[PDB]
From Swiss-Prot:
<comment type="function">
    <text>Serine/threonine protein kinase which activates checkpoint signaling upon double strand breaks (DSBs), apoptosis and genotoxic stresses such as ionizing ultraviolet A light (UVA), thereby acting as a DNA damage sensor. Recognizes the substrate consensus sequence [ST]-Q. Phosphorylates 'Ser-139' of histone variant H2AX at double strand breaks (DSBs), thereby regulating DNA damage response mechanism.</text>
</comment>
<comment type="similarity">
    <text>Belongs to the PI3/PI4-kinase family. ATM subfamily.</text>
</comment>
<comment type="subunit">
    <text>Homodimer. Dimers or tetramers in inactive state. On DNA damage, autophosphorylation dissociates ATM into monomers rendering them catalytically active. Binds p53/TP53, ABL1, BRCA1 and TERF1. Interacts with NBN (via FxF/Y motif). Part of the BRCA1-associated genome surveillance complex (BASC), which contains BRCA1, MSH2, MSH6, MLH1, ATM, BLM, PMS2 and the RAD50-MRE11-NBN protein complex. This association could be a dynamic process changing throughout the cell cycle and within subnuclear domains. Interacts with RAD17; DNA damage promotes the association.</text>
</comment>
<protein>
    <recommendedName>
        <fullName>Serine-protein kinase ATM</fullName>
    </recommendedName>
</protein>
<feature type="region of interest" description="Interaction with ABL1">
    <location>
        <begin position="175"/>
        <end position="184"/>
    </location>
</feature>
<feature type="modified residue" description="Phosphoserine; by autocatalysis">
    <location>
        <position position="648"/>
    </location>
</feature>
Length: 959
């Protein structure tokens, strides 16, 4: 203004200058410092550059009522309104009033006496808190990539251009030119490319020296009543105080973390209320604070120091995945981290009540690797100190690892260590009589979907350690978990389902900025069922975390039901953002049913939540809606679903809310149970439903999760049967194809008898030479048949990868190349989708196999009794595999034989190899019985023919 400049849109430059940060951020920020300003409206011109909030600063006028005019400008209705922000200045004043010229200046303090109000110190302290201060990987490749690509110019090619002057005519003037606007892009340019580290690696207050002096005047209610407060989001306030961060580095976190540090420092002094409001809130907050630091750090030591926990050694499976997280990179960092980070071992150090910790210690195996690690091992030993309880125990122990989040990817080596017990696996195989525990795999399959989209495929590799597999049997399919929900089934009425849903809400403790449902969690605390929580108040771990935290209730009105009509198509979410279509659901949700406001209680807190999370209950909503709808949605939903039915119909698009769409139908199939109470509740379900599964099946057919689909089909069938009953009553058309599609779903079943229920080499290489002259694998499967390193000449999938790795077994690199295949496998493994059925064995084969093929590498590496032991292993595996589908089995030791085939070949150096190979043929011999067991004619022939060709061309003992 004084140089009057910015009107040039030097602001725009300043705006451009802002391009570091988001809009008018410092404009906000230093408007704090604005108060330095004959500016009375005059600084504010800079708001032209930049008319509300800072009148709090205008309390500096109180430091007067021209503001009231300046208010009255906007309005004076605020006469108290924001004064907290000033009350912070008043805190600052109180600070000046507390413990200097400002201190001298403190006398204005009586100024409030326009107000008597000090009770509003009720809501207080946020800024009283907030007020501290004013009170290499790019270098990887010399090799072909930067040859294929180029490499970054560094040397004098940088300096190459330094010869200049003449043409800068343009240049120098271009600089003079709109570079006068443009050039600061230079000033703006530098910003980029560090991973710094600095976050940890890179005199605010001693309002610290002032810290509690009010609470001193106030009798430590900042402890005490601010304890009695619940301090509740006053905690979460801190998070908000963080939340702003963009560059927190020289920006907030340095203060802001220090704030957390102070918040810790706040949290620090805690004696009673620390748990005794909630450490639970507190800890997971620190956990989040960690999780932030995790997401991120230097003061995370304080976050460590939070392990102070002396009575708070009551820290718990609270502390578990936290600890579990707490590991994760801690050493991998600059050991300055480790310098403390061993505090985990300080954490480790006292066994008392660490049994769970021990029980939970599992990944400390990964903590037992690169450290120390030995201590971790020693801890893991101290963990394992009980008894290497194994077979399922480790498995259970392995099963016991779910306490954490996704990526831990840590200790899984024991999965490899399984084979070391794999006799116990036979012993494990002893388990046959029951319905479970092959899911120990599914536990991997769980891990398989677990963390799936995220980084570090080397996690997905651990399926290799998990790969020894695929004899499992005796069911179709998958399962759910968490009898807590059954413990929740202890609940009764869908307020319970809400109370249950509320768990999912409580199940949001979770992460940034969505914290709003705390108020909803408060809104939860509304009496509605609320004693349902008091009803719930007996058992639960999770509850107290909330019970400590949250906890006279409120209604809402409604008018037009049909006003919700247009959603389902729109909520069909033709475009992306199912969340939007869910926002439309959320709109359908925001469309306010008197079924539950208790639902609507969070609807906004819901609205910004994870859609599906809401959208899940959208079903539960829809059911309440269904429960509500007289004909209303009953009519309305009917087509609305029929829309969702049509939603993908005729090559239209439904996915990933498609299930979510079906999920409604699911909770329709499911949560509808008494809805329109009916003898087939199927009828009732159909009644609760939009009444045609015939589509829903096809919809499910798209959903393609068969059993339900099949059932839903069977329902659609039953619907057709109902329709047939209706046809009776009348007293892919006809859908036997749909039924065949269902048989194809029964094919999608992949249980062969059910499929039957649904039913109710070189010459190949020659044949392939035509192909050689869907393919590579077929070729390489034929290479997996024929002489890989040899018939690799036919390369002029996994099979190929295998054949390649088989070729890569020409040697060495295969060990890596395997990993690639193993990855390619692990990918193929990851390529698993829908997890409902058999052929996970067909999946797990090379998994169950190639690792052996991998394990074979010792042959390329390195008495031969190992080979026997491996044959024995293969045999043991075979025994393990003994009962199986030869169809499944088909490649497997065949591969091994194929593996053996050349394995013996370059091994013809050793005569024992031939004998081993003979024993391997003798191993391969068993195939015949298996082939007989297969009762597969084409199968047995080559073997002896091979055997005849093979070292059983020796043919001495005729066995």
């Amino acid at each position: 203004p004084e140089t009057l400049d910015e009107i040039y849109n030097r602001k725009s430059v300043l705006l451009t200058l802002i391009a570091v940060v988001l809009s008018c951020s410092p404009i906000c920020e230093k408007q704090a410092l604005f108060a330095l300003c004959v500016k009375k409206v005059l600084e504010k011109v800079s708001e032209t550059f930049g008319m509300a909030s800072h009148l709090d600063y205008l309390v500096l006028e109180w430091l007067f009522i021209l503001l009231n005019y300046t208010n009255i400008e906007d309005f004076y209705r605020s006469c108290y309104k924001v004064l907290i922000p000033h009350l912070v200045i008043r805190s600052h004043f109180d600070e000046v009033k507390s413990i200097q010229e400002d201190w001298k200046s403190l006398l204005t303090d009586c100024f409030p006496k326009i107000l008597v109000n000090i009770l509003p110190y009720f809501a207080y302290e946020g800024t009283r808190d907030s007020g501290m201060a004013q009170q290499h990987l790019f270098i990887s490749n010399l090799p072909e990539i930067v040859v294929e690509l180029l490499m970054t110019l560094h040397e004098p090619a940088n300096s190459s251009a330094s010869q200049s002057t003449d043409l800068c005519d343009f240049s120098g003037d271009l600089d003079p030119a709109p570079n006068p606007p443009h050039f600061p892009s230079h000033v703006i340019k530098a910003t980029f490319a560090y991973i710094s580290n600095c976050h940890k690696t890179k005199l605010s207050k001693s309002p610290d020296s002032y810290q509690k002096i009010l609470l001193a005047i106030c009798e430590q209610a900042a402890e005490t009543n601010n304890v009695y407060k619940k301090h509740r989001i006053l905690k979460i306030y801190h998070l908000f105080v963080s939340l702003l961060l963009k560059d927190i580095k020289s920006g907030l976190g340095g203060a802001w973390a220090f704030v957390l540090r102070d918040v810790i420092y706040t949290l620090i002094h805690y004696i009673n209320q620390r748990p005794s409001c909630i450490m639970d809130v507190s800890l997971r907050s620190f956990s989040l604070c960690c999780d932030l630091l995790s997401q991120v750090a230097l003061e995370n030591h304080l976050h460590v120091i939070v392990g102070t926990l002396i009575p708070l050694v009551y820290e718990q499976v609270e502390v578990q995945k936290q600890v579990l997280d707490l590991l994760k990179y801690l050493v991998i960092d600059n050991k300055d981290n480790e310098n403390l980070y061993i505090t985990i071992k300080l954490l480790d150090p006292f066994p008392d009540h660490v049994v769970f910790k021990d029980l939970r210690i599992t990944q400390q195996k990964i903590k037992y690797s690169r450290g120390l690690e030995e201590i971790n091992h020693f801890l893991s030993v101290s963990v394992y100190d009980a008894l290497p309880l194994t077979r399922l125990e480790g498995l259970k122990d392995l099963r016991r690892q779910l306490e954490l989040h996704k990526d831990q990817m840590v200790d899984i080596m024991r999965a490899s260590q399984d084979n070391p017990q794999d006799g116990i696996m036979v012993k494990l195989v002893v388990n046959l009589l029951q319905l479970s525990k092959m899911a120990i795999n599914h536990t991997g399959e769980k891990e398989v979907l677990e963390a799936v989209g995220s980084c570090l495929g080397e996690v997905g590799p651990i399926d290799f350690s998990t790969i020894a597999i695929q004899h499992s049997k005796d069911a179709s399919y998958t399962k759910a978990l968490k009898l807590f929900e059954d413990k929740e089934l202890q609940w009764t009425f869908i307020m319970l389902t809400y109370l249950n849903n509320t768990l999912v809400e409580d199940c949001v403790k979770v992460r940034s900025a969505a914290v709003t449902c705390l108020k909803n969690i408060l809104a939860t605390k509304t009496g509605h069922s609320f004693w349902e929580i008091y009803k719930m108040t007996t058992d639960p771990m999770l509850a107290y975390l909330q019970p400590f935290r949250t906890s006279p209730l409120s209604e809402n009105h409604d008018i037009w039901i049909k006003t919700l009509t247009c959603a389902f198509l729109d909520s069909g979410g033709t475009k992306c953002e199912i969340l939007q279509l869910l926002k439309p659901m959320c709109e359908v949700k925001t469309d306010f049913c008197q079924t539950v406001l208790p639902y609507l209680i969070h609807d906004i807190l819901l609205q910004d939540t994870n859609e599906s999370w809401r959208n899940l209950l959208s079903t539960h909503v829809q059911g309440f809606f269904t429960s509500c709808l007289r004909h209303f949605s009953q009519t309305s939903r009917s087509t609305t679903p029929a829309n969702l039915d049509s939603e993908s119909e005729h090559f239209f698009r439904c996915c990933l809310d498609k299930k979510s769409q079906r999920t409604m139908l699911a909770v329709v199939d499911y949560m509808r149970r008494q809805k329109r109470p009916s003898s087939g509740t199927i009828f009732n379900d159909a009644f609760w439903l939009d009444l045609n599964y015939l589509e829903v099946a096809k919809v499910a057919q798209s959903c393609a999760a068969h059993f339900t689909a099949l059932l839903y089909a069977e329902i659609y069938a039953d619907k057709k049967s109902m329709d047939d009953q209706e046809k009776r009553s009348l007293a892919e058309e006809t859908g036997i194809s749909l039924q065949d599609l269902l048989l194809e779903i029964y094919r999608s079943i992949g249980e062969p008898d059910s499929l039957y229920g649904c039913g109710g080499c070189h010459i190949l290489s020659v044949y392939l030479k035509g192909l050689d002259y869907e393919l590579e694998e077929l070729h390489y499967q034929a290479a997996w048949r024929n002489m890989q390193w040899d018939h690799c000449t036919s390369v002029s999938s996994y099979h190929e990868s295998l054949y390649n790795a088989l070729q890569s077994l020409r040697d060495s690199t295969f060990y890596e190349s395997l990993k690639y295949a193993r990855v390619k496998e692990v990918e193929e493994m990851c390529k698993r989708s829908l997890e409902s059925v058999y052929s996970l064995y067909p999946t797990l084969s090379r998994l169950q196999a190639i690792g052996e093929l991998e394990s074979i590498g010792e042959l390329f590496s390195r008495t031969h009794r190992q080979l026997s032991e491996v044959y024995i292993k293969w045999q043991k595996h075979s025994q393990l595999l003994k009962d199986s589908d030869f169809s499944f089995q088909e490649p497997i030791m065949a591969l091994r034989t194929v593996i053996l085939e050349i394995l013996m070949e370059k091994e013809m150096d050793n005569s024992q190899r031939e004998c081993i190979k003979d024993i391997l043929t003798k191993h391969l011999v068993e195939l015949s019985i298996l082939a007989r067991t297969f009762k597969n004619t084409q199968l047995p022939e080559r073997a002896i023919f091979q055997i005849k060709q093979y070292n059983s061309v020796s043919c001495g003992v005729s066995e």
